[PDB]
């Protein structure tokens with residue numbers, strides 16, 4: 001979750 | 016009164032900011048497509064078309080903002096977000112708009128070329144002739160130029176905005192008409208919001224000039240550019256940019272828009 | 283608002 | 298393309314799950 005909150009939408013696109 | 020249509024060959028048309036961008040800053044697809052189609056059919060007929068477009072800044076905001084949101088931490092997407100630099104926007108929006116124009120005109124069998132001139136380089140002497148030579152050659156080649164003020168690199172008391180660019184350009188090119196395509200359907204005796212005004216067919220000084228309300232631009236600059244463009248040749252016409260057929264009926268001799276003619280005292 | 287943030291979609295963050 | 302569209306239209310929490 002911390003990852004999901006300090007990450008950039010683009011990052012979500014990359015595994 | 017509008018009788019020059021039997022002579023007009025070289026035409027300069029300007030599309031403002033509220034004619035190219037609709038909702039959200041994206042392109043107004045139908046409006047731009049219709050205007051491009053009419054310009055293409057005008058070019059095919061034999062007229063020489065000069066285009067001075069605008070609206071790159073909005074496209075700018077759009078794509079740049081998107082990129083912002085794309086590369087921004089989810090939580091960080093709530094904290095204050097910087098405002099996109101005006102110059103930075105221009106550098107993206109001009110490219111986007113020029114590419115869209117190129118694709119439409121390649122679909123419409125017309126070839127266009129990019130021509131960016133900064134307004135502070137117009138005091139030079141060699142440019143005064145080089146611009147006239149290059150535009151003459153490209154018009155003889157049946158190629159529609161798309162002039163625009165270069166905002167990516169540049170440097171108020173004086174407003175030398177897009178209207179001034181179009182006016183002084185048509186002063187240089189020795190054109191015939193400088194059509195000002197805008198959201199409104201012409202001049203008005205005050206704001207168009209209320210119902211105590213009237214559409215003005217012809218612009219005579221000592222009947223409407225210092226008797227009407229004039230308000231990065233606005234009609235307080237539109238009128239000041241149009242008067243200077245008018246005196247020195249080149250009658251100008253202001254017409255609504257929404258209507259797709261407006262150019263045709265303007266050039267067919269019909270009575271559409273407002274005239275700023277140097278010999279308007281006769282009419 | 284963070285609660286709302288979590289609910290919204292990147293699409294919505296825009297507009 | 299479809300994955301991009303799915304990610305563009307999803308809830309943060311959904312992105313988590």
Ligand SMILES: Nc1ncnc2c1ncn2[C@@H]1O[C@H](COP(=O)(O)OP(=O)(O)O)[C@@H](O)[C@H]1O
Pocket residue numbers: 031032033197198199201202203204205206207227228229230231232233234237
């Ligand atoms: N007679 C008038 N007096 C004052 N304001 C006017 C008058 N007629 C129109 N306006 C307003 O001024 C604005 C001028 O827009 P315009 O300068 O043509 O395009 P842009 O500002 O988007 O480049 C219009 O949106 C219109 O609402």
Ligand SMILES: N[C@H](CCC(=O)OP(=O)(O)O)C(=O)O
Pocket residue numbers: 031032069070071072164166176177178231232233
């Ligand atoms: N590049 C844009 C062109 C748009 C524009 O100039 O319209 P105007 O300020 O004359 O109403 C700008 O300089 O603001």
